[PDB]
Ligand binder design. Structure first.
Ligand SMILES: Nc1ncnc2c1ncn2[C@H]1C[C@H](O)[C@@H](COP(=O)(O)OP(=O)(O)OP(=O)(O)O)O1
Ligand SMILES: Nc1ncnc2c1ncn2[C@H]1C[C@H](O)[C@@H](COP(=O)(O)OP(=O)(O)OP(=O)(O)O)O1
Ligand SMILES: [Mg+2]
Ligand SMILES: [Mg+2]
Ligand SMILES: [Zn+2]
Ligand SMILES: [Zn+2]
Lengths: 593, 586
């Protein structure tokens, strides 16, 4: 059977032209080949559970639609040549549209404040309306319902950086009123940590858990963010800093225990710490995080030298945006489109000037596509399809359009600008200059973007879980032996490249600021003080987001431990949890993916 | 742009032939026209965005399911039969329910929570949950299980023994000092509330999952849980009065809660043993009668025996509510009775010949679907079966019927005296014969295919319109009805209630309670009414009110909200058996 998809003939002609230029294999690589054949797809799938099938089946189709709609909007906004160039660039892998199956339908991510949930309840869920919570149990429930709702209204992370700020209030409320028996206080609190955590590790996105983030806000961040802000009882939140800190500590301690009973990925843990001139301004919290991380190293370190960006937070945008975690409160991205840097290397043939010309052009194109996607999102808002915006939870003016990068290293290598020395692999001095130039060029274009388009652009060295493979594959298809890499890197130095850790640290210290913390350094693994000094040294060097990695063992029943033998049930290790792209996941899963 | 779906040529040729015969607009009516065009569908669609991703693929997974069923029927019965089923499905002679899921997952089941209480959540792989030790987590587990189950099946997730198991965790939490003494009621009710509000969240996304609660009378608790024990070793039957009190507690709570916020789920049934003109649990019956006075939000299930639930498949299966513990259906396929009326030309013999044949076809399609489900189980796609929550041997294949009235009307077997619209005597005989034929075939089915068939007069929320439309398309002015009926006589028919009751009293037993009677509307009068209706042999029934709501969702009666003062904007009403917003229904 043949099914008609009703495209404007110009798009049809484009698609035929591109299929004629590149061949069916390219489209197949892009996921617009046999994947559109529902019979083949289903037959393929039936040889996880059935609920997945209904998620996966339509992705090629909604990607195709999204691409078509983006092409329409871009043609409208910039003319046929630009739209055509973007489609060709997306299909052939010069760029990478993230969440492409969602791209014309809904936005990427946001790190929310729970203030509107606490204050208004759940009016935006309309099968049934909930009043503002009056108890801990229901605050927790509301957070769950909100996460489930938001996770199906966006493609990326649902951040909850101020969770404990608000949780504390209901803990105190229920303690005071005798809803929580005093002698059951600790059990209660931990029972609600547990209920939340487990719920956040259920398959609500069907195929997988939603992606959620928690942040341990240090005293500086709480004070800065919540200056002047009041709880429902009318009291100042800033008057309860120690209570909030203590509750955050309780969760982190609980987590660390609870892993023994059951390992879990979510929420991803970040600790946000103010650090300047060689010292933490909330040293007690830094030392706490340092101590608690000793066991599983399950928390990512976020370092900032200023709270100016988050000052009194609760048009040009300044707060940190990171796909892994550590996104500042009320910051997100509506879409990421990544520039394929190795492609430019391959196209450049070693000419750095050529490279930079092409790069600038591509980033201008990507900006145009982001602007288009933003217009489409505005259309969706207007059509009533995205109630997170209408209810003031997701804020469009607090969302960047993201210019993604991947394959910096491989790009440098193809250009002949990498080498080895006694310290291991590294950039040549000219290579380091080259990366400086690349990042600086992208920065300049991002900066001009705000005046060009009226919203703010950011840069991120993206996790690229899929893009890292797909782009390498496409480049390999187009350039063959010239592209020797099977996967592109999502860190300045490839994770699996024996190098001096000091050089990794150095490069992150040089380049994190250029992407405004849109990166991660994670170092695979003494005394507690040595750990603290290591942390300080890393922070001193200007690294903005980092973590250390252990290899966490798990048995078939999900108990977390180290070694080949479970201390709870005595069963054998059957899998590992590791931080591969910045959060803790099963290695079997990742390998399979 | 052309996109290729790779079918066997025989099926492509079949579909080409059917398209040649019936024309594009039939395919359109079947949901295999424009709806397959993702661009048109998408641009027409642009509820929230989450809906879009649910709806977009339905035509496609339907097309695939129709194809796979065709393949399996060809395998099992040969090409002619498979072809005939596809033709019948496309042209509306039969109606395949949940057709977008039909080759992928099963329909419904009424679960016991015993394995959840005893094993926790093993079927969930992202994180493993131990058995609940507390009420809070028992509630959470029920929530997670409902969410899981509702995405592994197309229809109701029944929880008839919910309160049996909730009571244990109430008692347990109480013993352990977890509950604030002086706030026991608040606590129990807070958990009622948490569960109930969770069960009315969009997590089938477009709409809430469909769940059922049953108030089990003392006879049912005793019969079902003879010999069974709680985790602490105590006999469940030692706690009948405790269980009843908790059920009573829930029913009262809901009745209050509706004023603060109206909700559909869970659909409430009360299951009562009634024999020789009296309830064997009269306390419960009077309780239900009393609580129903406010909202009439509970459906009455009447049985003359508990043999089927004690300790070939026998228990009651009903798509609205009241399905017995550990009973379900893996799929319903409905016969279009008006089609048969129209094909027969008024000849009752021919009508019955066609009916019998078409029901045999339906049995074959059901057998095929069951084989497919079994394949899906073997492929590890349906863990509800692997974990012994859904039990395939406790699932009927369901022969649906709809448009009984309209069918009899087209045959010239209905009339109108002074007591309003009714069947003629020969019409009553006609319905007798139709249902007897379907029954005969359903019974032969067991020995034919190795599993049990039931019959239901289905709610037909969609089918009632779609089938009427297709028949209008094929037969024109010979089919004068805008919609087909899902009760023995149409809800909005000028008809004496005594007739409705009599018909239900005649024909409910023939479909083994796979039907519902509901009538649009002092305590004693109410109770006498209930008793009289039960005397007549009606097996499942309800009375309806018009329940107003304001924008804030408060339930009330009248044009203005007594709580907030805002105007009425919508109505909750029982249209097909459960209470739903009228606005949405249209
Ligand atoms: N929201 C949830 N969804 C699914 N499983 C959950 C949820 N919350 C907790 N669980 C899991 C954790 C345990 O594996 C299991 C039982 O939890 P619970 O009854 O609280 O006992 P427990 O082992 O936590 O003992 P205690 O609470 O007395 O410390 O359910
Ligand atoms: N699981 C849930 N999901 C969404 N909303 C819920 C859930 N459970 C309860 N709610 C709603 C009911 C109320 O509208 C709102 C607040 O409930 P709650 O904090 O218990 O206050 P309440 O009004 O029930 O007072 P009280 O519990 O003191 O009688 O949340
Ligand atoms: Mg617990
Ligand atoms: Mg409450
Ligand atoms: Zn173990
Ligand atoms: Zn009101």
């Amino acid at each position: 059977m043949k099914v008609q998809y009703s495209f404007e003939r110009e798009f049809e002609e484009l698609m035929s032209d591109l299929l004629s230029k590149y061949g069916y294999e390219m489209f197949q690589m892009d996921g617009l080949g046999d994947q559109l054949d529902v019979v083949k797809f289903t037959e393929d799938f039936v040889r996880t559970n059935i609920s997945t099938y209904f998620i996966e089946i339509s992705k090629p189709h909604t990607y195709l639609y999204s691409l078509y709609r983006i092409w329409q909007k871009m043609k409208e906004m910039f003319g046929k040549g630009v739209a055509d160039e973007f489609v060709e660039a997306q299909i052939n892998g010069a760029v990478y549209l993230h969440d492409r199956h969602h791209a014309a339908l809904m936005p990427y991510c946001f790190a929310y404040t729970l203030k509107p949930i606490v204050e208004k309840g759940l009016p935006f869920i309309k099968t049934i309306k909930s009043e503002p919570a009056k108890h801990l149990s229901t605050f927790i429930q509301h957070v769950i319902q909100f996460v489930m709702f938001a996770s199906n209204q966006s493609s990326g992370a649902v951040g909850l950086p101020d969770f404990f700020v608000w949780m504390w209030y209901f803990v105190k409320k229920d303690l005071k009123e005798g809803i929580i028996p005093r002698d059951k206080l600790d059990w209660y609190i931990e029972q609600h940590f547990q209920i939340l955590t487990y719920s956040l590790n259920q398959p609500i996105r069907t195929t997988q858990s939603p992606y959620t983030n928690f942040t341990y806000l240090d005293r500086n961040y709480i004070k800065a963010i919540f200056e002047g802000e009041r709880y429902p009882d009318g009291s100042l939140i800033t008057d309860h800093v120690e209570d909030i800190i203590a509750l955050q500590k309780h969760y982190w301690e609980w987590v660390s225990r609870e892993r023994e009973r059951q390992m879990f990925t979510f929420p991803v843990l970040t600790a946000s710490l103010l650090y300047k001139d060689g010292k933490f301004l909330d040293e007690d919290s830094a030392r706490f995080i340092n101590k608690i991380n000793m066991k599983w190293q399950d928390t990512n370190w976020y370092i900032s030298d200023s709270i100016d960006a988050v000052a009194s937070c609760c048009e040009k945008l300044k707060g940190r945006m990171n796909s892994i975690g550590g996104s500042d409160l009320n910051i997100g991205s509506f879409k990421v489109i990544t520039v394929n840097l190795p492609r430019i290397a391959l196209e450049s043939g070693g000419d750095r000037e050529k490279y930079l010309q092409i790069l600038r052009h591509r980033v201008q194109l990507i900006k145009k596509a982001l602007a288009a996607v933003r217009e489409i999102i505005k259309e969706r808002i207007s059509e009533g399809l995205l109630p997170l915006y209408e209810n003031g939870l997701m804020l469009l003016n607090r969302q960047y359009g993201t210019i993604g990068v991947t394959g910096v290293w491989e790009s440098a290598s193809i250009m002949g600008l990498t080498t080895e020395d006694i310290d291991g692999l590294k950039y040549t001095e000219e290579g380091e200059v080259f990366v400086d130039n690349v990042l600086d060029t992208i920065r300049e274009e991002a900066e001009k973007g705000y005046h060009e388009y009226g919203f703010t652009f950011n840069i991120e060295q993206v996790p690229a879980e899929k893009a890292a493979v797909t782009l390498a594959q496409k480049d390999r298809f187009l350039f063959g032996e010239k592209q020797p890499f099977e996967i592109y890197s999502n860190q300045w130095v490839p994770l699996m490249a024996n190098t001096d850790v000091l050089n990794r640290i150095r490069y992150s210290g040089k380049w994190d600021k250029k992407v405004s913390g849109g990166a991660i350094l994670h170092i695979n693994l003494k005394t507690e003080e040595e750990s603290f000094n290591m942390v300080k040294m890393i922070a001193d060097m200007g690294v903005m987001y980092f973590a250390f990695n252990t290899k966490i063992s798990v048995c078939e029943d999900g108990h977390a431990f180290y070694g080949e033998r479970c201390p709870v049930c005595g069963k054998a290790k059957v899998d590992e949890y590791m931080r591969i792209v910045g959060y803790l996941v099963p290695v079997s899963a990742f390998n399979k993916e």
